[PDB]
Write a protein that holds these residues in place. Sequence first.
Motif, mmCIF file in Angstrom:
data_model
loop_
_atom_site.group_PDB
_atom_site.id
_atom_site.type_symbol
_atom_site.label_atom_id
_atom_site.label_comp_id
_atom_site.label_asym_id
_atom_site.label_seq_id
_atom_site.Cartn_x
_atom_site.Cartn_y
_atom_site.Cartn_z
ATOM 1 N N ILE A 6 -32.806 5.887 1.641
ATOM 2 C CA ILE A 6 -31.510 5.798 0.902
ATOM 3 C C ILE A 6 -31.765 5.217 -0.497
ATOM 4 N N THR A 7 -32.518 4.117 -0.593
ATOM 5 C CA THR A 7 -32.776 3.393 -1.868
ATOM 6 C C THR A 7 -33.602 4.285 -2.809
ATOM 7 N N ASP A 8 -34.569 5.041 -2.277
ATOM 8 C CA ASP A 8 -35.422 5.976 -3.063
ATOM 9 C C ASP A 8 -34.587 7.182 -3.512
ATOM 10 N N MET A 9 -33.688 7.675 -2.654
ATOM 11 C CA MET A 9 -32.732 8.770 -2.980
ATOM 12 C C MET A 9 -31.865 8.343 -4.171
ATOM 13 N N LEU A 10 -31.306 7.130 -4.128
ATOM 14 C CA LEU A 10 -30.345 6.628 -5.149
ATOM 15 C C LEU A 10 -31.079 6.345 -6.466
ATOM 16 N N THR A 11 -32.294 5.793 -6.407
ATOM 17 C CA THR A 11 -33.178 5.556 -7.581
ATOM 18 C C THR A 11 -33.483 6.893 -8.273
ATOM 19 N N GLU A 12 -33.661 7.966 -7.499
ATOM 20 C CA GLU A 12 -34.008 9.319 -8.010
ATOM 21 C C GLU A 12 -32.782 9.931 -8.703
ATOM 22 N N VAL A 20 -31.685 13.133 -17.782
ATOM 23 C CA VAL A 20 -31.218 14.546 -17.940
ATOM 24 C C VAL A 20 -29.762 14.549 -18.426
ATOM 25 N N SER A 21 -28.833 13.987 -17.641
ATOM 26 C CA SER A 21 -27.367 13.988 -17.907
ATOM 27 C C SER A 21 -27.013 13.082 -19.093
ATOM 28 N N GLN A 22 -27.866 12.101 -19.409
ATOM 29 C CA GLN A 22 -27.632 11.052 -20.441
ATOM 30 C C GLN A 22 -26.341 10.282 -20.128
ATOM 31 N N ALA A 23 -26.033 10.104 -18.837
ATOM 32 C CA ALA A 23 -24.878 9.335 -18.319
ATOM 33 C C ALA A 23 -25.366 7.948 -17.888
ATOM 34 N N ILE A 24 -25.419 7.008 -18.837
ATOM 35 C CA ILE A 24 -26.041 5.661 -18.665
ATOM 36 C C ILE A 24 -25.212 4.818 -17.683
ATOM 37 N N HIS A 25 -23.917 5.111 -17.528
ATOM 38 C CA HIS A 25 -23.007 4.368 -16.612
ATOM 39 C C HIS A 25 -23.179 4.875 -15.174
ATOM 40 N N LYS A 26 -23.438 6.174 -14.985
ATOM 41 C CA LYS A 26 -23.778 6.768 -13.660
ATOM 42 C C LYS A 26 -25.154 6.253 -13.217
ATOM 43 N N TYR A 27 -26.110 6.186 -14.148
ATOM 44 C CA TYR A 27 -27.444 5.560 -13.950
ATOM 45 C C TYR A 27 -27.255 4.168 -13.339
ATOM 46 N N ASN A 28 -26.458 3.327 -14.007
ATOM 47 C CA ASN A 28 -26.236 1.899 -13.650
ATOM 48 C C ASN A 28 -25.438 1.799 -12.341
ATOM 49 N N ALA A 29 -24.590 2.786 -12.022
ATOM 50 C CA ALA A 29 -23.826 2.845 -10.751
ATOM 51 C C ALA A 29 -24.787 3.115 -9.586
ATOM 52 N N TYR A 30 -25.732 4.042 -9.768
ATOM 53 C CA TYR A 30 -26.722 4.443 -8.731
ATOM 54 C C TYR A 30 -27.714 3.297 -8.495
ATOM 55 N N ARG A 31 -28.100 2.575 -9.555
ATOM 56 C CA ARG A 31 -29.025 1.409 -9.485
ATOM 57 C C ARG A 31 -28.354 0.249 -8.744
ATOM 58 N N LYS A 32 -27.090 -0.047 -9.072
ATOM 59 C CA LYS A 32 -26.276 -1.090 -8.392
ATOM 60 C C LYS A 32 -26.270 -0.790 -6.890
ATOM 61 N N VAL A 36 -28.021 -3.235 -3.963
ATOM 62 C CA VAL A 36 -27.177 -3.885 -2.914
ATOM 63 C C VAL A 36 -27.651 -3.410 -1.533
ATOM 64 N N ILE A 37 -27.949 -2.116 -1.388
ATOM 65 C CA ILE A 37 -28.415 -1.504 -0.108
ATOM 66 C C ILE A 37 -29.808 -2.055 0.236
ATOM 67 N N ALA A 38 -30.679 -2.229 -0.763
ATOM 68 C CA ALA A 38 -32.048 -2.774 -0.593
ATOM 69 C C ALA A 38 -31.986 -4.243 -0.148
ATOM 70 N N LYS A 39 -30.917 -4.971 -0.500
ATOM 71 C CA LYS A 39 -30.735 -6.417 -0.175
ATOM 72 C C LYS A 39 -30.008 -6.594 1.166
ATOM 73 N N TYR A 40 -29.319 -5.553 1.644
ATOM 74 C CA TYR A 40 -28.618 -5.508 2.954
ATOM 75 C C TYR A 40 -29.650 -5.666 4.071
ATOM 76 N N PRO A 41 -29.479 -6.645 4.995
ATOM 77 C CA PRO A 41 -30.474 -6.926 6.036
ATOM 78 C C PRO A 41 -30.322 -6.150 7.357
ATOM 79 N N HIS A 42 -29.472 -5.116 7.388
ATOM 80 C CA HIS A 42 -29.295 -4.193 8.542
ATOM 81 C C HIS A 42 -29.653 -2.765 8.117
ATOM 82 N N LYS A 43 -30.181 -1.956 9.040
ATOM 83 C CA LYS A 43 -30.326 -0.489 8.843
ATOM 84 C C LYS A 43 -28.921 0.117 8.798
#
Length: 325
Positions: A6-12, A20-32, A36-43
């Motif tokens: 999931i985290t590698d999918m969202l980073t990609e 490509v899209s030059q959408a810096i706010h969508k970039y920052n939404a996908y990184r956020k 948060v998912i990478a810090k979540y301690p459950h699968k």
Amino acid sequence: TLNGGITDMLTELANFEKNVSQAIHKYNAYRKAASVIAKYPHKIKSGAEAKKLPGVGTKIAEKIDEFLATGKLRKLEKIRQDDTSSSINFLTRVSGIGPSAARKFVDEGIKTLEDLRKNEDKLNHHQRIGLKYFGDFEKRIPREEMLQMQDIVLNEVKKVDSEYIATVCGSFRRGAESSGDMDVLLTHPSFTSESTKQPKLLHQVVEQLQKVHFITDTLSKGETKFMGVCQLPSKEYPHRRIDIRLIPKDQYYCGVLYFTGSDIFNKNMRAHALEKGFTINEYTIRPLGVTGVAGEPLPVDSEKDIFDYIQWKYREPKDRSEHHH
DNA sequence: GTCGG
DNA sequence: GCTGATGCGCC
DNA sequence: CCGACGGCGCATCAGC
Ligand SMILES: *CC[C@H](OP(*)(=O)O)[C@H](O)COP(=O)(O)O
Ligand SMILES: [Mn+2]
Ligand SMILES: [Mn+2]
Ligand SMILES: [Mn+2]
Ligand SMILES: [Mn+2]
Ligand SMILES: [Mn+2]
Ligand SMILES: [Mn+2]
Ligand SMILES: [Mn+2]
Ligand SMILES: [Mn+2]
Ligand SMILES: [Mn+2]
Ligand SMILES: [Mn+2]
Ligand SMILES: [Mn+2]
């Protein structure tokens, strides 16, 4: 690596939106979402579960669901097949080539490292140094080497003027066992927020580091920030990126908070400040007035004072890194 | 793309 | 020259 | 075209 897919999918998706899209706010939404998912301690079992986390909405929930069922994402499959998108994404990994320059180069038929090396005359100085050291800048720096690099910088800065204080910040100060580069915070008494007594304060340090053949190349240089290339003497070590930032001595705590990071921590902290009615940068913390305009700098005698103003439990540099489970 | 308003 | 915007980058 | 989203240094160009 818990929820690694999931985290590698969202980073990609993040990298596609920026490059490509030059959408810096969508970039920052996908990184956020990825942080948060990478810090979540459950699968994560479903999209509905992930939606409970902040930054995960309807759309990201619907492609977690798809990824979990199929182990893939049609959108990402289609993006990888797009040789144009693939070439743009690749070219941005060169320092000095961003989304705009990368797209211009690919549309003029530059698709590979070979094509880039043949079209060296199309590149400005920055892009040329970025290309020359592409391979080297991809490698991480073992902490043992960062300590070697710290010894050389501290010693040469001292030899220029004992009144200088240099702090290695970034991932190194956060206690990482490897770093992407060396980030040096520099102060001198003669440079404060309201007075410049001495000129050429940053230049004198760069010249000394160049004289002893530690700094080999310059990407960009101004009065307060140096961006360039360094190399340890051989016992050949790879060439390394080095950032030097000269900060006003009376604003050291705001400076060191910024340059310690991480980038995502700073973004979240400065975002929380705005919620509490403050604006933070590398110099000051200022209250926002009724207007939303920044008032006078508040007094800061420690990193902890900045946290206290925005009602955050103080976090040691080690706890300001991104983590996984 | 999320989210506050 | 200054200001503002674009494009590159820093944490 | 709901519109903000962290904040800024260096390099360069556009308009004044
Ligand atoms: C992730 C799916 C997209 O979310 P965003 O607001 O970037 C869109 O919902 C679908 O993308 P499209 O099919 O390319 O419009
Ligand atoms: Mn691990
Ligand atoms: Mn966690
Ligand atoms: Mn939610
Ligand atoms: Mn790049
Ligand atoms: Mn061509
Ligand atoms: Mn040519
Ligand atoms: Mn760094
Ligand atoms: Mn750096
Ligand atoms: Mn908050
Ligand atoms: Mn970085
Ligand atoms: Mn909108």
